[model samples]
Target: YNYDEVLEKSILFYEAERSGDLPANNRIPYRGDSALGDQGNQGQDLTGGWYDAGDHVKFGFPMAFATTTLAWGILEFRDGYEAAGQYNLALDSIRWTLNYFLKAHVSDNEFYGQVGDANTDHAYWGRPEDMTMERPAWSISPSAPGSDLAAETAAALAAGYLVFRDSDAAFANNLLAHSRTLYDFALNNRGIYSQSISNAAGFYASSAYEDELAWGAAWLYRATEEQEYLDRAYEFGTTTNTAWAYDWNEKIVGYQLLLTTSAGQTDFLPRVENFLRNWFPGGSVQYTPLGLAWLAQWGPNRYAANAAFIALVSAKYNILASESEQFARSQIHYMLGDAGRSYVVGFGNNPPQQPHHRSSSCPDEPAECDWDEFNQPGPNYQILYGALVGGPDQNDQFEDLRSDYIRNEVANDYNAGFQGAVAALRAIQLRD
Candidate 1:
């Protein structure tokens, strides 16, 4: 029943995050309002989306990963607990969060001005020349808006529906609608999308530049079982011909900055595997602890560390183990010997130092953000670390991590798709 207890606890933690208490940075005063002039059209308040680093990023990646992980786990653990009760609860939470976020009011474009209400010098996509107070929302901004992050959110939502048997048809339909809209834009409109009706910003050269492509396409396939998405995925994943993020070819980047597709490709798996391989202690993945953890979650491996992850995914889905996955298992097994403590402490240390921690709450101070010490002894660290490691403090970590990710501590926007990972892990651990 320890696993059952863990699942129950995971549920509680996730619930609290969805409630908006733990991701504290989102509560911060948004400076974007004052920056707007009298002529600026006041958009509706968008207070509900996941914050980036301090909130959304932390929550999105872990939550999405957890959702998928837990969902798969439950499938394996089904006989003991009525799968519907446990799985639906988790799935519902994820669905509600993502839908609310996607529909929330936002400026027409990411570059129209500062996102949300953050008061900071940070700017993700707007051109400098376009800066002016009197400029209309449509007239000033140019290029693809940062709205593509929605793809990641949609992917997670659709995937959540894919696993949970009891999801509402309306919900699934809504996800499908969003997916089609995104695919149409990326495919028909030369791979660009805009949040604004005016089409102020919408462009794409690399799939990685658009987080939604990977998230959107993957989840869309899961929802519809459509071969088109699978085909699109393979096409986008190409390195030589069609030209997408995979072509830009920087290893060790997260799915956020990689090519996306609808179809499953053995060849792309290796490229993705190669990217995961870099997470080894000596590779470029070392720079980002979260990224390394991400690679470890999906990369092929056969040890306790990876076994826990692999079993969750492998047991539920009929996915065949690729040659690269087999090879990844051997390599990751060896690499596990050097694996260090979890990065929750490191995340806490890296509190968004700049006052304008709008994107996220966790500052990115390298020296300040260290997780190794969390593995040490101290009352505060002990309790918080325990929660972070999936112990009693699970709820606390959920809140804190959600705030870090949603607030943009790691990236500019919160990606709601990660809740699936949380589901996957929870489902896996349910095995009695």
Candidate 2:
């Protein structure tokens, strides 16, 4: 029903990408700029110190490609764009990410650390090491490098697998070989990955960021159905905390975990719904444009869409208050849309003007005043623009935000996984 919106936004998103509207230099354009940051100069204030153009490797191409890759996958599966086109976009994203990873790789053989910094003027931004100003992963040689290698390699393999699929069996085999090598490095090193090379680095380090082990394992298992991969994924999934100080942890990990588990399973779907609810609070699946866009654009995982849609219907009809309904509502009202468009009835916060809901505290009344938890916009706040006007079809109320002339890539990490999953899924699906 909403296929048209999916196709329309997919095109607009791509156009925005091409026009350099999205952040290309790994820096988000601040001061009310909606497009991606520029790629050239680094660490320079663009407009009165509101926006800084820093390294482009970490956040620029790789990260953008990650999101772009997912969008391509969604377009390929849902819109049925030319396979070659999808494959090309997917492969280009992988190549760019691999090249960047090669640049980020800290050690020669161990592959433990990744260096994301600004050399001279601009470099890769948003990389964990860059923010911490640390050497690389917490460990120096034996663990840190290997862990980074394992995580990044695993991600690469997943992306490679998707791009090559059966069309290029040799490439797929090479990717698997790399995956095995990296996995071995992880198993031989420690229970999980490290952020730095020194003993001083705590277990509480940025290990949370590299939680792509399940993504790696899921793709590997799908490629080979190897029991070891599944076992390792389960092991890694158990160690990862789905929640943090905020209640969004469970919701955050739900999709990743669901991908790791068997598809079409009822149990995993609830977990996914739980995450959706936590993310959004009182909406329906069909109408929750952002969640729908995510599902439709990211991987077009039908099972996930079904779960979210069913839950939304239940909430709309007063049949149930599952997380999915909350998520649908939240995505529509809280996260993606203005308060006027929300199912919550009356809540509004305009961007670049309305004070951030989280900026202050309401002392007397909680119900009447907008709270921080649900009112604040995040770094990816521009996603709201996409949510309103950039779905599969043009059913959203805010369609003016849609731009068809610009083009930008997706996130690097997600792109890698998309490549990997596509390769394996296509191989399996096409096998005679």
Candidate 3:
């Protein structure tokens, strides 16, 4: 499946969605495009993060989730990044988000959770640099607590701590300090971040905070090996069943995997067993007309990719290596080309020419882009290289229409597990 090429391009996809000023070490020349409006009250520089999706808004909940997932992949499969000649590139991707997270923390108790309203951002259809709407920053404070955002951000920072520990001890220590403070804030303040930051509810609405609590605690345990964090993880982990797909809101699969793999704990093995039951050939989860795993109607490929990630990680723990590797490869192969076409935007055969992404749809400004571009789309004016679009319907039919966001949208969280799965597969291939 050309694992090397996929690994390189998937990392480049992160660079394309990068926000703020591009660093001197940046590899992708086509990106480093704009410095976004990530300022807080009175011009606090909350810049330098990834856009949440096809849209330009920085939804912290999902962005942190994506960062955590990506860092987790690096943590688990450093060999893959090294083998693919992308170890530094992967670290750069993580550091970009980690730097933003450090800024987002603002203070020990106050954390700015979101920037730019979804409705306001969606109302405009041009570049992020061209937006004129009021991008009010939202925060979760001690008075109005948000456990999920705080915990997930903590998880992201904690995972970053692991990723940078050897490479840069000072930066890693700083991340660990923030992780501790944020984890304390989350543990002390018990409520969903979406509820506390009501504006974010519309965009990154979290259903339950338990999984996040577990996810955060597990990450902290991985970073520190502290028994308290381990206890907290188990306390929250047992309260939820194994989730089918882990996303921005749901994180049961992540917590379970963390407990099993990083902590070397066997108590979560039963949950892992339960998760595997659904992904196998005759289990509860369904598949597309092609070989892709189909869990829900929306964004079927995301579900497939995420499930494939868990399967690969499980293989590392010797849970069901043979069966899990086969399943992971099948789903990844479907995304690559096996489904008669590539679902990722710019690679393999007949890739989506018009993903529902605003930045990629328009030319480099002064080009008179408007609703017409979305309406009469032959292809995107600029190629959104390495962006993985929301894939085919359950029937295996796909449309590369820019107006159809449900089918054509590209997202940071959407690619998180897919890229991780790619790394996993590449690492396995290297071993073979």
Candidate 4:
């Protein structure tokens, strides 16, 4: 289980999750060009973003967070991605999302948050290409604004500017301009994203928008290095209130991280420490039999990986020199086969087989795949290589059940932090 190798696959996993015209270099043999001509309500092109989870819906909330998180990794640990030969691939994965973001943000304050109906999409189980259901897009506008969605997406574009500025200055400049507009839109019009776009409520319900508002502002500060942006971030975000976690829904922990690491605000350092403390032994968080930090029943593996990313990043800053790096490795290593079973499909020893992924679950189109394929007690017709499945329960109980989406599903958010943590592990190794 080499860190660089793990990072390599982790980055490639996003390719399998790609929704738009499959690239020629696309490595997921099972997947094909899907969800073509995905357009928003008012004719805005809404294609090329990664499929959100086991299903085909494109939930922007988690998608944006995942992109921002991945860009953070690439921006911080370029050495790891470079040494592992995943530098451009990582950028490609991020660029795909950023390009989709460009299309989704049709106008100032008008952005598509979702492109498919959750209920309609979930009812059927088959390849995205075969599905003929009408996909009505939803957006946030002046009348009904989704601050969380808008701000989170703003964060994504802002971070994209940071990572892509040098490689593609012209494109990166466009990303930066939008980031500023979206941040201003988010602050000027404040409301829950899912509430405004109720279609997203069942799948990606947001708790608050303030954290995202600050998150977008923080990223803007990093991109522009302007005190005005940083001051705006401080106005909405607080380090005094320690965050519980830093997954898709939460951005408070991320806000603190950017403040300290990206902006040289050492005072925010303690905020991250306060958050990481609860993740270790005898803290508020629970651990599985194999020592996975069980944050919630849903996507526990994703949660552990999220914590591991934060821990590893903290270790880089020498936050918890004695314990942070080790803690992160265990969390990542467990997913990589140290736990007696691998959670990442197609990597390490005995990785998951029946990941609750639709495209991979079906056989080749001519073979006639349907509900029958979903019920079969066997591996997917094709391997979902490098995809990280939603992991075991609190007791570390797991199965290869394709129907058990909570445990077997793969998602963009699940791999974002994990990939970065893997990169951090390799970056640390390479430097030494």
Candidate 5:
């Protein structure tokens, strides 16, 4: 399957979606040319992060979640990156987001959670460099607390701390300190950030904060091995049921995976067992004719990738390793090419050429873009390398259309779990 090639390209995808200055050594050329001067209120330098998706909007909630998932994958599959000679690239990816997270942490108790309004941003299909809408920054604070957003950021920073601890002690300590601060804010100031900050409700709506609380503490415990963090994780895990698929809003599956891996906690076993029960041969989740595990009518590939990640991680503890690995492989292979086509934008046979991402659909700035460019019905003007699109329908049918967001939109969170699953698969393949 050329796992190494795919993994390397997938990592490069992050660089392609970068929002700030393109590092001088960046491999992707089209990357550093946009969103160079992005800023916020009161001189808040909100620059230098990956664009949330195909769009230029930077939603910190999901952005942090993506970073955390990527870091988690690296921590679990370091050998994969090392073997592929991408260990430094992986670090650069994590550090890029972590740096933006640091900037988002505007104050001790305040964190900017979002950069652009989805409603306003979606109305225009032009380049981020040309957007003139109000990009007001939203945040969570003691007055209006957002535990989920804060905690997720904390998890990302904590995971980053672990990744850089041995190689760079000073940077690791800095991340650890931020992790501690954010975790305290989440624990002490209790409220769902999405709900509190109504502006972000439509895009990053969080159903519950318990899962995030647990997920954050689990990472904290993993980084620091602190008993209090472990206790908090166990407490939260017992309360939140295992989710169907972990995404930006729901995080119970992640929390369960971390707790099980770190402390061998078994209280969540029944929940995990129930989740697996539905995915096997004849349980509940509908499988496409092509053997892809289907979860929802929208973004089937994202759900499949996320579920595959959980399954692969579960295999580490010998919890249905053989069965889980088989299912995981089936789903991942379906994305890679098993369905007679590839869902990833670049790197596979018959990949989608017209993803519903604005940045990729339009050409270089001097080239005028309008409704015609968006609705031309041809391949995207530029290649969105390594971006995974919203996948096929329940019937395994897919169309590469720019208007069908449900079937073609790309997102940061959409790739988070998928990338991790890919790394895990590569690690397993190496072992074999």
Candidate 6:
């Protein structure tokens, strides 16, 4: 299916989802400069970071997961990105969020974890630039600590550091510095981020903070090869808990994979294998008749997509290599159109054209957009290029209706692991 082509477009999903300031080279012609007034209560500028999903809210939890995963792909399958002529483009995608995280971190003990309220943001049905309602911000601090948000952001920055180390040494060091500081803040003041930033609870309440602690530490350990970080990772990160799936919420599989690669650990390998067994045929996970490893009703494709990369990475480590690679190929292939229709927008036959995304649903200026636009049964005014939509149900039923957000909404988190899987496959092809 030309994975390199999908790899090239996969990065565009991030481009389409950018908030704060739109760049000069922005491909989405309809996306204007937006969220120019985004700031914390104290007037700390918070005008960057991608919007979470079909909505404009910038939930830190999923964005951190997206950035960390993106950086992981670019770092591991860099040759694939370079081969697709998207190395600089992909690098810019990660830098866009890492730089925003810098602003969110006003100090060592304080960091704004979320910008804009979900209820407020979801109430609107227009472009980001056209919004007029209040967009409040949320933060976590020593008094109201958020162990997961802090650590996940730390993991992203630490991974970002590795991505930029050779290309931009100074910038890389800055990222590493922030990574260490955020990790300290997380460890020193531990609690669920949703507890402090209550606004996020309704949208993305954390399931567990322990995985992030280990995740951030492992990335730091990999970035600096520092023994202290390694010690911290083993202490907090090592677990035999069966990973449900590596999506926006859970991250045990991530640290397990990291420990496998970096520390050469055996304990995490079994957990990773256990996680894989759940999705394979004759396992606990349900498979659509069309061959998708359907995991959950919401973004079921993403759950399987996340596992696809995990499976690919597992193959690299010789953990059920042949079966894992084959498993990844089937799921990714399903997204690319092996299942009679492509779930990804702007790619193969019958690609998604009506993603339940706000900005893409709006037309060029001078055309008023409201609930009417949202209700229109037509393709989006602007193509959310490379965006992967919320997929089918357990029985493989899906519709192109924009209002059916459960089956059509697209988010940066959904595309993160899918893009990485594409890059990994491309890397394998290049190696062959």
Alpha-carbon runs more than 4 Å astray in model 6: none
Model 3 lDDT, full chain set: 0.84
Candidate 4 residue lDDT tens string, 1-432? 777677777777788788988788878777787788789766777878988887889999999999999999898888888988889989988999999989999999888888888999888889887878878788898888888888889899999999999899999999999988988888898899899989888888999888998899899999999889999888989878988888889898898988888788887888899888889877789888778989988888888889888887777777885588888888888899887988888888888999998888999758877798899899998877788888988888897899897899899999999999888888888878
- The residue-level lDDT of candidate 4 at 164 comes to 94
Cα lDDT tens digits, model 2, 1-432, are 122222233232222222122334422122122212222122221111001111222222223224323432432332232321344444443443343333323333344232223242222122211123321122234534435335545555554555565566776566656656655655566433333433223211233433445545655665567788766656665433432211101112422433423322233444443444533434232433434333333222222332333334333323344444444333332322333332110112332111111111122222232224223333222331111221233133332221210111121231122232233233223332
Measured with C-alpha atoms, the lDDT of residue 309 in candidate 6 is: 83
Q: Per-candidate RMSD vs. true structure?
A: 11.2, 13.3, 1.5, 1.2, 1.6, 1.1
Candidate 5's displacement at residue 51, Å, is 1.4
> Which parts of model 2 have CA positions greater than 4 angstroms off?
1-54, 57-87, 99-109, 112-140, 146-149, 191-194, 197-211, 239-270, 283-432
Q: Please, what is the whole-model Cα lDDT of each candidate in the order they appear?
A: 0.33, 0.33, 0.84, 0.87, 0.83, 0.88
Query: After TM-score superposition, what is the CA distance of residue 92 in candidate 4 from its true location, in Å?
Result: 0.6
Relative to the true structure, candidate 6 reaches a TM of 0.98
Model 4: worst 10 consecutive residues (lDDT sum): 313-322
lDDT of 3 at 132: 66
Worst 10 residues of 3 by lDDT: 28-37
Tens-digit lDDT track for model 1 on 1-432?
132433343343344233222233322221121212212245533233233222221222223333333443343444433432455555544554555434431332221221322222122212111223232322112354333433444444555555543546776566556546544544433333333332222221223324345545655665677788756554443433221111111111223222222243445444444433443345443222322223222111111223323322332333333432343333222222223322222223332122112221222222232233222222221111101221111111222232222221221111111222233433434543
Candidate 6 per-residue lDDT over residues 1-432, each given as its tens digit: 977778767888788888987887887778888888889889999998999888999899899999999899887778778888888999998899999999999988899999888888898899888998889988999999999999999999999999999999999899999999999999999999998888888878997899899899999989888899888888987566888899878889989988887678777888888888888887889899889998878898888999998888787778898888889989999999997889998888999889999988888897998988899988989877788888988888888899888889788889999998888888888878
Top lDDT model: 6
Q: Which clashing pairs does model 4 show?
A: none
Q: lDDT ranking from best to worst?
A: 6, 4, 3, 5, 2, 1
Identify the runs in model 3 with alpha carbons over 4 angstroms from their true place.
25-37
> Over the stretch 1-432, how does candidate 5's per-residue lDDT look in tens digits?
877777787787787778876777978654445665566567788888888877777888889999998898888888777777778888988799999989888888988888777788777887766677777777889998999999999999999999999898898899989999998999999998988778778777888888899999999998888899989987776634657776777888788877777667777776776676678768788888778888887778888888888888888677788998898888888998998998888878999988888767777758877667788879988787778788999888988888887889888877888888888888887889
